[PDB]
Design an enzyme around this catalytic site. Structure first.
Site, PDB file in Angstrom:
ATOM      1  N   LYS A1025       0.796  -1.233   0.000  1.00 19.87           N
ATOM      2  CA  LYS A1025       0.000   0.000   0.000  1.00 19.87           C
ATOM      3  C   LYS A1025       0.833   1.291   0.000  1.00 19.87           C
ATOM      4  O   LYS A1025       0.462   2.241  -0.690  1.00 19.87           O
ATOM      5  CB  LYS A1025      -0.977  -0.008   1.199  1.00 19.87           C
ATOM      6  CG  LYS A1025      -1.851  -1.271   1.331  1.00 19.87           C
ATOM      7  CD  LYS A1025      -2.717  -1.596   0.103  1.00 19.87           C
ATOM      8  CE  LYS A1025      -3.519  -2.892   0.305  1.00 19.87           C
ATOM      9  NZ  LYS A1025      -4.320  -3.236  -0.881  1.00 19.87           N
ATOM     10  N   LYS A1067      -6.407   2.222   8.593  1.00 14.15           N
ATOM     11  CA  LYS A1067      -6.572   1.058   7.716  1.00 14.15           C
ATOM     12  C   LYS A1067      -5.400   0.090   7.917  1.00 14.15           C
ATOM     13  O   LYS A1067      -4.276   0.550   8.098  1.00 14.15           O
ATOM     14  CB  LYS A1067      -6.840   1.409   6.236  1.00 14.15           C
ATOM     15  CG  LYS A1067      -8.089   2.274   5.981  1.00 14.15           C
ATOM     16  CD  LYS A1067      -8.283   2.662   4.505  1.00 14.15           C
ATOM     17  CE  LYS A1067      -8.422   1.464   3.549  1.00 14.15           C
ATOM     18  NZ  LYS A1067      -8.679   1.889   2.160  1.00 14.15           N
ATOM     19  N   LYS A1110      -7.083  10.347   4.709  1.00 12.50           N
ATOM     20  CA  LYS A1110      -8.099  11.382   4.846  1.00 12.50           C
ATOM     21  C   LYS A1110      -9.498  10.791   4.665  1.00 12.50           C
ATOM     22  O   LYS A1110      -9.765  10.205   3.615  1.00 12.50           O
ATOM     23  CB  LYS A1110      -7.779  12.487   3.813  1.00 12.50           C
ATOM     24  CG  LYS A1110      -8.737  13.690   3.815  1.00 12.50           C
ATOM     25  CD  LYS A1110      -8.189  14.856   2.975  1.00 12.50           C
ATOM     26  CE  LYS A1110      -9.041  16.128   3.104  1.00 12.50           C
ATOM     27  NZ  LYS A1110      -8.425  17.270   2.403  1.00 12.50           N
ATOM     28  N   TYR A1111     -10.360  10.964   5.684  1.00 13.71           N
ATOM     29  CA  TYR A1111     -11.754  10.544   5.599  1.00 13.71           C
ATOM     30  C   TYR A1111     -12.555  11.574   4.795  1.00 13.71           C
ATOM     31  O   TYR A1111     -12.879  12.646   5.308  1.00 13.71           O
ATOM     32  CB  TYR A1111     -12.367  10.289   6.992  1.00 13.71           C
ATOM     33  CG  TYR A1111     -13.804   9.782   6.981  1.00 13.71           C
ATOM     34  CD1 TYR A1111     -14.192   8.726   6.127  1.00 13.71           C
ATOM     35  CD2 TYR A1111     -14.765  10.363   7.831  1.00 13.71           C
ATOM     36  CE1 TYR A1111     -15.523   8.269   6.116  1.00 13.71           C
ATOM     37  CE2 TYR A1111     -16.089   9.883   7.849  1.00 13.71           C
ATOM     38  CZ  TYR A1111     -16.473   8.845   6.979  1.00 13.71           C
ATOM     39  OH  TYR A1111     -17.763   8.402   6.966  1.00 13.71           O
ATOM     40  N   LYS A1146     -19.773  -4.196  -2.781  1.00 13.33           N
ATOM     41  CA  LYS A1146     -20.499  -3.534  -3.871  1.00 13.33           C
ATOM     42  C   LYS A1146     -21.815  -4.269  -4.191  1.00 13.33           C
ATOM     43  O   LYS A1146     -21.836  -5.501  -4.148  1.00 13.33           O
ATOM     44  CB  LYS A1146     -19.568  -3.475  -5.098  1.00 13.33           C
ATOM     45  CG  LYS A1146     -18.218  -2.775  -4.835  1.00 13.33           C
ATOM     46  CD  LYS A1146     -17.157  -3.075  -5.907  1.00 13.33           C
ATOM     47  CE  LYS A1146     -15.780  -2.514  -5.521  1.00 13.33           C
ATOM     48  NZ  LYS A1146     -14.727  -2.934  -6.459  1.00 13.33           N
ATOM     49  N   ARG A1202      -5.518  -8.105 -10.277  1.00 12.55           N
ATOM     50  CA  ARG A1202      -6.223  -9.295 -10.752  1.00 12.55           C
ATOM     51  C   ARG A1202      -7.585  -8.912 -11.365  1.00 12.55           C
ATOM     52  O   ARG A1202      -7.932  -7.730 -11.435  1.00 12.55           O
ATOM     53  CB  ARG A1202      -6.324 -10.353  -9.609  1.00 12.55           C
ATOM     54  CG  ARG A1202      -6.763  -9.850  -8.213  1.00 12.55           C
ATOM     55  CD  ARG A1202      -8.225  -9.386  -8.104  1.00 12.55           C
ATOM     56  NE  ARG A1202      -8.534  -8.775  -6.805  1.00 12.55           N
ATOM     57  CZ  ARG A1202      -9.733  -8.333  -6.380  1.00 12.55           C
ATOM     58  NH1 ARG A1202     -10.841  -8.437  -7.130  1.00 12.55           N
ATOM     59  NH2 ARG A1202      -9.815  -7.763  -5.173  1.00 12.55           N
ATOM     60  N   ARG A1246     -25.770  -7.243  -7.987  1.00 10.90           N
ATOM     61  CA  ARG A1246     -25.359  -8.499  -7.375  1.00 10.90           C
ATOM     62  C   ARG A1246     -26.562  -9.069  -6.620  1.00 10.90           C
ATOM     63  O   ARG A1246     -26.934  -8.532  -5.576  1.00 10.90           O
ATOM     64  CB  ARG A1246     -24.156  -8.294  -6.436  1.00 10.90           C
ATOM     65  CG  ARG A1246     -22.899  -7.765  -7.142  1.00 10.90           C
ATOM     66  CD  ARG A1246     -21.632  -8.029  -6.314  1.00 10.90           C
ATOM     67  NE  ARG A1246     -20.462  -7.317  -6.845  1.00 10.90           N
ATOM     68  CZ  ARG A1246     -19.195  -7.381  -6.396  1.00 10.90           C
ATOM     69  NH1 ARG A1246     -18.838  -8.170  -5.372  1.00 10.90           N
ATOM     70  NH2 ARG A1246     -18.266  -6.627  -6.986  1.00 10.90           N
TER      71      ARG A1246
HETATM   72  N1  LIG Z   1     -12.466   7.981   3.821  1.00 12.41           N
HETATM   73  C1  LIG Z   1     -12.921   7.180   2.861  1.00 12.41           C
HETATM   74  N2  LIG Z   1     -13.097   7.686   1.618  1.00 12.41           N
HETATM   75  C2  LIG Z   1     -13.555   6.874   0.657  1.00 12.41           C
HETATM   76  N3  LIG Z   1     -13.882   5.586   0.727  1.00 12.41           N
HETATM   77  C3  LIG Z   1     -13.700   5.112   1.969  1.00 12.41           C
HETATM   78  C4  LIG Z   1     -13.236   5.824   3.059  1.00 12.41           C
HETATM   79  N4  LIG Z   1     -13.175   5.007   4.179  1.00 12.41           N
HETATM   80  C5  LIG Z   1     -13.596   3.842   3.755  1.00 12.41           C
HETATM   81  N5  LIG Z   1     -13.929   3.834   2.424  1.00 12.41           N
HETATM   82  C6  LIG Z   1     -14.428   2.696   1.663  1.00 12.41           C
HETATM   83  O1  LIG Z   1     -13.362   1.968   1.095  1.00 12.41           O
HETATM   84  C7  LIG Z   1     -13.283   2.219  -0.331  1.00 12.41           C
HETATM   85  C8  LIG Z   1     -11.843   2.152  -0.779  1.00 12.41           C
HETATM   86  O2  LIG Z   1     -11.550   0.812  -1.251  1.00 12.41           O
HETATM   87  P1  LIG Z   1     -11.831  -0.423  -0.268  1.00 12.41           P
HETATM   88  O3  LIG Z   1     -13.286  -0.478   0.058  1.00 12.41           O
HETATM   89  O4  LIG Z   1     -10.854  -0.393   0.862  1.00 12.41           O
HETATM   90  O5  LIG Z   1     -11.470  -1.664  -1.216  1.00 12.41           O
HETATM   91  P2  LIG Z   1     -11.411  -3.245  -0.919  1.00 12.41           P
HETATM   92  O6  LIG Z   1     -11.927  -3.410   0.489  1.00 12.41           O
HETATM   93  O7  LIG Z   1     -12.301  -3.897  -1.947  1.00 12.41           O
HETATM   94  O8  LIG Z   1      -9.964  -3.646  -1.060  1.00 12.41           O
HETATM   95  C9  LIG Z   1     -14.072   3.517  -0.541  1.00 12.41           C
HETATM   96  O9  LIG Z   1     -14.636   3.571  -1.845  1.00 12.41           O
HETATM   97  C10 LIG Z   1     -15.165   3.400   0.526  1.00 12.41           C
HETATM   98  O10 LIG Z   1     -16.275   2.651   0.079  1.00 12.41           O
HETATM   99 MG   LIG Z   2     -12.607  -1.334  -2.656  1.00  8.80          MG
END
Ligand SMILES: Nc1ncnc2c1ncn2[C@@H]1O[C@H](COP(=O)(O)OP(=O)(O)O)[C@@H](O)[C@H]1O
Ligand SMILES: [Mg+2]
Length: 1361
Positions: A1025, A1067, A1110-1111, A1146, A1202, A1246
């Site tokens: 990351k 995260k 950043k949220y 999703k 992927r 889905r």
């Molecule tokens: N501060 C944030 N801004 C945008 N998205 C966030 C935030 N915090 C959590 N998310 C969620 O996580 C997404 C970013 O990808 P993520 O969901 O972590 O992917 P995956 O879990 O499929 O690997 C955002 O689109 C949102 O739905």
């Molecule tokens: Mg995602």
């Protein structure tokens, strides 16, 4: 070629430890179960450092604990022979195996002689005993119990390292089952010849570690911990050793037990020897190459060729000393298995794999401030709990004298007042030790800054009266500030005189006195040094009156002896004569200097050593000690000029050096304090975070090239401290040398094995030594070992001094068994310096000249003219080594061959599909459409699933077994064994399970199986990351603002969060799927929420690493589909918007974004190409962007390396098939011919098997509904695509996801796509199960959704409406 194969197999088996067939821990009967081990981990976590020390460390130190012979006697067998030889105890006992009795050999470290500390003849006895049991085909049980092998002067004079290197060589190459059992403590290079076993066990209260826990005190001083803290941080309990994979189980027995558990030791031995023999028979069933290795080893016994026959005579090794005593075919299997287990106990990663720490919110010069703050923190902790004055009679009697003379009529008042404060300042100087200077400055600042309400405060009663309470009172305050100021000048005076002790020693040797000018000028210079290194207002004249007062106290000799006792820890480089003359200077010559101030005739200066002790040979030991201080000084000058680096060593003799795997580095899965900061610092300086550099070089031997292997130690990282990555680099180099037929040259310098890598680092001694033992015994090519600089610890004690290598040392090399960090007291240059060891038999094949240090041999001849000088050059040794070999005709040069999928990419007519569910149905459908046969793998519920029913008679189905993912799909070795068995053209890694793991990609490509997707390099760059953000930063792609690297602690998280502005995100780095994503609203919350979310990440993934973002509260989750071939055509197909999502998963996904400007759409298209080209990406991929609705900006978040489940939306609207393009790319074809379109609009719902149910407040949620489907109709419609596993009579399994279909609608425009999907969801029928469709229909009939006005947090708000 078994030598090449064992590194291949052991690399494969270390990519996924849990599901590997190296797990023999299930076999042994008498071990503790994994539940009791998990419960003991919970207790050791919840306990402190003292509770950990009591549980783990104290029972192995116990002198009442049964010895090695008493444990062997209480196996209750028949003893046949014994050999007690000091702390060595070999034996031989018949045990009953139920079918019959069997001879089992023993070699044990006996704690009831020398505590288990082994000497050189005990290692030579262990060498002999290991051959003796091999010649008689007797299995061996090793018993480990040692403080480490001896680092003393007698040991190194007898060549300690050279006895251990042979003992590890015999153990690694023995032709019988070896079991290790830790019966006490397994520390350092004394534990590793015995712990080099096939199966290494421990008793319930045993320990195994890199060194003894008190030896960590040097590393504890450097980073401001205790040695007890360093011991828990390293993780030395049998439970933690089993978790890290160092040991193969914990035997439910402790040496003192006399219940049912005393029977578990013989049972564990019986089932261990039987388990190794069943495993070794299974290896001879399946390895046809184990026959070839045995026949090649047999052919050497039939015809012993003169060059290796002469090596076997000089080395004395365990060979076929008779045709009758020649090993069997299974004998070679025990060597092979023993390497695989030793090599999978060690573990290392790469620079691309390692997650980089945050540079953001880090002050300049931070290290000194953090250590200052730790020294202040422990000082403030003493201000919060100071010691009582009743604890010591010396301080208690001075308090009684003070209080009595305070009421008395002014001289006795002032004498008793000064004496109380003086002895308190020496008491705290004994207590605070190496930090005492810092803590006395903080005590002076405290005393000056104290409130008048505390300075005028009258003393508590004697039982509650503390040493702090005594000195904070005003009457004792400012005189104690004066005592502290003079103790600072004494500590500088003492340490300056210790560093100047050679000038005192010379004059004592050559006149037997220290003259009055020499004591005057040394005292002058040391006070001038003290008061120019410190800006303290207390001057030389005030300190001189204190020095007279100190030399007027009757306990002044006792204060110097107390000081010398704790100073001996910090200065283990001085002998007894040097400590005595140091003490005599302070005790006698400084009083004699004052006494002779009035009349100089009273001074004699004469050192009488008898007044400090009747030490024999005092002046000849003083001569040796001075010569060794000059040798230490000369080697420090050589370190400070820094001539012997890896680059400089190479440039002196070699040209066009090509490094093999320069990116290999420390795994650090214990996460030792300040060691990750050292890996960062190394990386920022461009230095390899690895103790070794390895490659192949040209050597121009009389103008003409000779290709040789070259392994040079990295003195730029941790002084060349050898590591688990160094061991993998050495095995890789010896493999390139075995393939190309290169002679091997090595230049080795080490401080020892890297202790900050855990107990796992020790196995590197046996791994690298075995690869050098096998390299000469299978490939014949000479290994040179030029020991340079400091060549100490486990590097010295194994491979450097191994009996088949030509051992060399440079002039001035320090070569003892262990270095200054581990050694308790001074070791003479006769037992440590390579010059004096040059003529000592078996120490080396020659002492060579040091080609950097110009004047070294004349500088060493001025120190001692009777010192043995060097004779050969490094060029002379190399030209003589190369010219005496047969010059075989060299093949045309090849590159360093690595994992490259592009070579494996050949036309696909049969493919393995690693998937279940709708993803397997999608991939099985694409396999038909591309005319490829499917090899499907499945769990027991999924053997009768719809993806299995979709297969033809020409397609294969294979049982993985079990119900859950762990029992089936996550077993990578079962899936690879199916890929090898069916001989598949490629493997599609699917979606979910192991799809995005670069370890599973590497596992396939190691074995030559084509991986359908990106390169392993591309997966680690955009999967890590921090490195995904750093590559985006390099390509001018805006990232989601944050720490950008990984956060260290809660203070780091607060500071980066404050700079971004609250609320913010925490995260996990090894996260994904929304797991461990915590929102933090405040600084007040962040302190608790960091510790909390670090525990969420550590529980979920086994890594507590957080990184901050950043949220953004109002966003769209925009994601852009990349395709790319091996040629470099970055065909970006278009974007999707996946903003209707529930718990990150999703739900309603789209081909466009109704709030995204066309200019920002063009920016994310350009950024996808920049990333795709700059990582050299292949196959299908999806980069994810946050499209901030408040700011009107697009920010890169992460990448999917992927296939993405949302893909058939983009297949419609790009006009390009994503899985067919990926199968063309993985067949080695170009995608240049493709034309991405924007065909209408598309949307995916889905469809999931979930029922509506209320939460604790009454808001509607969806939760899974498993069960049998009774009816299921999807009507045929041209502008909808249906991927599904739902049909009449099929069951939806509770062990897997509720995803039962993907319904992807197409149409001209967005309103039409919504209306057609709404109408289609009503024409769709599902029965038996409940489904999410009552919610899906209502989102499509919402006015705000039909206008396209929403954000990612729309769905949980709308479910509450
Ligand atoms: N501060 C944030 N801004 C945008 N998205 C966030 C935030 N915090 C959590 N998310 C969620 O996580 C997404 C970013 O990808 P993520 O969901 O972590 O992917 P995956 O879990 O499929 O690997 C955002 O689109 C949102 O739905
Ligand atoms: Mg995602």
């Amino acid at each position: 070629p078994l030598f090449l194969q064992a590194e291949h197999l052991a690399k494969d088996f270390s990519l996924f430890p849990k599901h590997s067939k190296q797990s023999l821990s299930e076999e042994i009967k008498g071990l503790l179960n994994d539940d009791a081990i998990q419960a003991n981990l919970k207790d050791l976590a919840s306990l402190d450092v003292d509770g950990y020390v009591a549980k783990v460390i104290q029972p192995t130190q116990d002198k009442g604990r049964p010895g090695a012979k008493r444990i062997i006697a209480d196996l209750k067998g028949r003893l046949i022979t014994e050999t007690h030889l000091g702390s060595f105890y070999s034996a031989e006992v018949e045990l009953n195996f139920g079918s019959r009795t069997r001879r089992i050999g023993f070699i044990a470290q006996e704690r009831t002689t020398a505590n288990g500390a082994w000497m050189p003849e005990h290692h030579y006895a262990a060498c002999k005993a290991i051959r003796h049991f091999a010649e008689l085909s007797m299995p061996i049980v090793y018993l480990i119990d040692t403080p480490g092998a001896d680092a003393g002067e007698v040991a190194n004079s007898q060549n300690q390292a050279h006895s251990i290197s042979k003992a590890i060589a015999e153990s690694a190459n023995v032709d019988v089952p070896t079991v290790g059992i830790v019966i006490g403590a397994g520390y350092s290079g004394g534990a590793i010849p015995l712990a080099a076993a096939n199966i290494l066990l421990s008793l319930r209260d045993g320990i195994f570690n890199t060194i003894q826990p008190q030896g960590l005190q040097s590393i504890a001083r450097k980073y401001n911990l205790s040695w007890q803290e360093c011991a828990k941080s390293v993780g030395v309990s049998p439970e933690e050793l089993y978790t890290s994979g160092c040991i193969d189980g914990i035997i439910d027995f402790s040496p003192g037990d006399r219940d049912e558990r005393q029977h578990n030791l013989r049972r564990a031995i019986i089932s261990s020897i039987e388990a190794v023999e069943r495993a070794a028979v299974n290896f001879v069933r399946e390895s046809k190459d184990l026959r070839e290795h045995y026949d090649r080893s047999l052919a050497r016994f039939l015809n012993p060729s003169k060059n290796l026959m002469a090596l076997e005579l000089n080395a004395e090794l365990a060979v076929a000393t008779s045709p009758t005593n020649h090993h069997n075919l299974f004998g070679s299997a025990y060597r092979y298995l023993r390497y695989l287990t030793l090599r999978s106990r060690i573990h290392s990663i790469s620079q691309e794999q390692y997650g980089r720490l945050s540079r953001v919110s880090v002050p300049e010069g931070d290290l000194l401030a953090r250590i200052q703050q730790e020294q202040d923190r422990v000082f403030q902790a003493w201000l919060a709990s100071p010691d009582k004055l009743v604890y010591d009679e010396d301080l208690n009697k001075l308090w009684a004298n003070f209080i009595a003379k305070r009421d008395e009529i002014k001289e006795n008042y002032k004498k008793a007042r000064k004496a109380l404060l003086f002895n308190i300042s020496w008491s705290l100087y004994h207590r605070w030790k190496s930090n005492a200077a810092n803590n006395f400055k903080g005590l002076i600042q405290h005393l000056e800054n104290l409130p008048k309400s505390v300075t005028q405060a009258k003393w508590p009663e004697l039982n509650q009266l503390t040493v702090l309470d005594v000195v904070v009172n005003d009457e004792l305050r400012e005189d104690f500030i004066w005592q502290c100021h003079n103790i600072l000048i004494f500590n500088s005076l003492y340490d300056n005189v210790v560093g100047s002790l050679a000038s005192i020693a010379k004059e004592a040797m050559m006149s037997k006195s220290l003259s009055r000018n020499s004591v005057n000028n040394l005292l002058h210079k040391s006070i001038d040094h003290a008061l120019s290194t410190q800006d303290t207002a207390n001057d030389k004249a005030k300190f001189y009156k204190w020095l007279k007062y100190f030399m007027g106290q009757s306990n002044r000799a006792d204060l110097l002896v107390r000081v010398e006792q704790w100073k001996s820890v910090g200065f283990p480089q001085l002998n007894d004569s040097l400590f005595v003359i140091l003490t005599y200077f302070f005790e006698r010559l400084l009083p004699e200097y004052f006494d002779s101030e009035s009349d100089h005739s009273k001074y004699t200066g004469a050192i009488n050593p008898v007044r400090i002790g009747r030490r024999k040979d005092f002046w000849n030991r003083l001569t040796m000690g001075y010569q060794d201080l000059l040798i230490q000084k000369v080697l420090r000058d050589e370190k400070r000029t820094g001539k012997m680096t890896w680059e400089n060593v190479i440039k002196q003799f070699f040209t066009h050096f090509d490094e093999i795997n320069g990116d290999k580095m420390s795994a650090n899965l214990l996460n030792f304090p300040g060691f990750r900061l050292s890996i960062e610092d190394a990386l920022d300086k461009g230095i390899r975070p690895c103790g070794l550099i390895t490659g192949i070089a040209d050597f121009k031997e009389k103008g003409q090239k000779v290709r040789v292997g070259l392994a040079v130690s990295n003195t730029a990282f941790q002084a060349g401290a050898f590591d688990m990555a160094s061991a993998e680099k050495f095995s890789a180099l010896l493999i390139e040398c075995a393939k190309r037929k290169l002679p091997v040259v090595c230049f080795i310098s080490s401080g020892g094995m890297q202790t900050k890598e855990g107990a796992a680092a020790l196995f590197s001694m046996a791994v690298v030594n075995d690869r050098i033992t096998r390299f000469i015994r299978d490939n014949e090519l000479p290994v040179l070992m030029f020991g340079f600089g400091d060549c100490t610890g486990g590097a010295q004690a194994s491979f450097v001094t191994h009996p088949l290598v030509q051992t060399y040392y440079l002039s001035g090399t320090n070569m003892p068994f262990a270095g200054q960090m581990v050694v308790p007291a001074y070791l003479p240059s006769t037992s440590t310096l390579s010059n004096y060891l040059s003529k000592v038999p078996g120490a080396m094949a020659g002492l060579v000249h040091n080609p950097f240090s110009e004047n070294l041999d004349n500088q060493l001849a001025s120190i001692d003219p009777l010192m043995p000088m060097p004779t050969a050059k490094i060029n002379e040794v190399i030209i003589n080594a190369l010219s005496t070999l047969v010059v075989e005709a060299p093949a045309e040069e090849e590159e360093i061959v690595q994992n490259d999928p592009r070579k494996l990419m050949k036309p696909i007519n049969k493919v393995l599909v690693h998937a279940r569910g709708c993803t397997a149905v999608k991939l099985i459908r694409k396999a038909h459409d591309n005319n490829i046969n499917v090899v499907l793998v499945a769990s027991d519920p999924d053997m009768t699933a719809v993806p299995a029913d979709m297969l033809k008679e020409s397609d294969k189905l294979v049982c993985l077994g079990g119900n859950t993912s762990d029992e089936s799909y996550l077993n990578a070795y079962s899936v690879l064994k199916v890929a090898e068995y069916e001989q598949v053209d490629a493997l599609h890694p699917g979606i979910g399970f192991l799809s995005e793991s670069p370890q599973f990609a590497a596992l396939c490509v190691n074995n030559g199986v084509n991986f359908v997707g990106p390169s392993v390099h591309s997966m680690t760059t955009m999967g890590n990351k921090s490195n995904a953000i750093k590559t985006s930063q390099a390509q001018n792609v805006p990232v989601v603002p944050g720490s950008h690297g990984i956060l260290t602690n809660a203070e780091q998280a607060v500071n980066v969060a404050s700079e971004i502005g609250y609320p913010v995100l925490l995260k996990a780095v090894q996260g994904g799927g929304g797991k461990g994503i915590q929102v933090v609203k405040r600084p007040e919350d962040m302190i608790g929420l960091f510790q909390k979310t670090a525990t969420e990440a550590a529980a979920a993934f086994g890594n507590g690493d957080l990184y901050l973002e950043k949220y953004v509260t109002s966003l769209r989750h925009i994601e852009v589909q990349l395709l790319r071939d091996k040629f470099g055509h970055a065909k970006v197909l278009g974007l999707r918007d996946c903003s209707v999502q529930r718990n990150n998963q999703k739900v309603v996904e789209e081909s466009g974004s109704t709030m995204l400007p066309d200019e920002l759409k063009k920016q994310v298209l350009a950024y996808t190409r920049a990333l795709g080209d700059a990582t050299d990406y292949m196959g299908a991929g999806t980069v994810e962007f946050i499209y901030n609705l408040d700011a009107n900006e697009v920010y890169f978040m992460e990448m999917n390396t992927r296939l993405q489940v949302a893909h058939p939306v983009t297949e419609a609207t790009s006009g390009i098939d994503i899985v067919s393009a990926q199968f063309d790319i993985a067949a080695g074809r170009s995608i240049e011919h493709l034309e991405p379109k924007e065909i209408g609009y598309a949307m995916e719902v889905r469809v999931t098997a979930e029922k509506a149910a209320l939460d604790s407040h009454g808001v509607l949620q969806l939760i899974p509904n498993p069960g049998k489907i009774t009816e299921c109709v999807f009507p045929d419609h041209p502008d909808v695509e249906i991927i599904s596993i739902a049909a009449p009579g099929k069951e939806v399994s509770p062990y897997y996801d509720s995803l039962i279909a993907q319904v992807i609608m197409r149409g001209e425009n967005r309103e039409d796509v919504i209306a057609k999907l709404h109408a289609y969801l009503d024409s769709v029928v599902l029965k038996g199960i409940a489904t999410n469709i009552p919610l899906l229909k209502l989102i499509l009939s919402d006015g705000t959704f039909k206008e396209g006005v929403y954000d990612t947090n729309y769905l949980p708000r709308f479910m509450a409406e």
